[PDB]
Amino acid sequence: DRELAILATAENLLEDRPLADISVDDLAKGAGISRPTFYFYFPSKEAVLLTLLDRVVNQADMALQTLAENPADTDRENMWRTGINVFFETFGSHKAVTRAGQAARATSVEVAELWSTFMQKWIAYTAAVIDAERDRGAAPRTLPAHELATALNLMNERTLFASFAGEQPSVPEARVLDTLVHIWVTSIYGE
Amino acid sequence: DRELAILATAENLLEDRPLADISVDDLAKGAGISRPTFYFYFPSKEAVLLTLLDRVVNQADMALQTLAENPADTDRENMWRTGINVFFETFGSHKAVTRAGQAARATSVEVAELWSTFMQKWIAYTAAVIDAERDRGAAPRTLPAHELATALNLMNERTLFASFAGEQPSVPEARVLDTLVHIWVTSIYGE
């Protein structure tokens, strides 16, 4: 409960400044508690980011499980769009956590490992689906499915996050979904 | 001259530990000079990284100008491979600088702007070539050329650098060139 308060406060404060510029004291008063009461719920401001990013990533993950268990009744282009869109919408709704999470991969081993565990899972799911499409005679046996899936997933990570942070250069947010779908569909079905 | 010594020393020390863990004193003795003599050539260890990354990136840039002025006499797949290979070979030969440079984008505005200036130039060159291919009737008018070029360049940045750092996940270094060429050629020529 106070736990949700510290989390919401961190997400809000990260909408306006980096983690380096937010104090434990800043998070404490935000949730309406003392510095020492803060330390009962979290070991550090860094563990607060790790928890937010845990929640964002698991939300993406569950949303993609829900898609996998309940296929959308559509063509191959839309099957892939619906999947990429889990990442667009989920992270797109949590840009501050997304951006702060990505910078913490450099400094925090737990953040790096969390990102790494989920990226390995999403790449493995992507490759299994390409393999199914190949077994069905729907896609040609070009590159190793897992090598292809790895590059395409790395493209979506870099390209979504550049867009969300308004980096230069970046695809504009309103064009990025279509851009990625074109590259997935041409690279998975092209000869 | 002592300048080249500080640069070589920094590159060597970055083959073994991050910049955070290298002192000005560490760079100074490396080049066989005093701390204060160091400060005559460079304002900081951070300006030393900025200079290395300047050199790496300009080397990539000149190598791609040389390709553009002197076309390779080959099919479209090899034209693109020869281009992606400038980035593979150049950065691939300077992984420590590459990796330390990429982490410094987060903390250093000069590093971020340098990376941003060159990425904008390589994306602009990529789009002009796709446009030429389209004007020639060699590629179909699918996505906006600059949106396509931006995503494909962002894919090569993330995917090359994950490979070079042996990240998990990543395409293995010996498979990454072929992986990227397949995605460029299918996405640029596919309908």
Ligand SMILES: O=C(NCCC(F)(F)F)c1ccccc1
């Ligand atoms: O879009 C994807 N991956 C991007 C994951 C991200 F953004 F890098 F975290 C994806 C799409 C369909 C099925 C599986 C994965």
Ligand SMILES: O=C(NCCC(F)(F)F)c1ccccc1
């Ligand atoms: O491979 C490329 N871009 C990647 C640039 C990098 F790696 F991201 F720095 C490229 C290929 C052909 C022509 C122009 C650019």
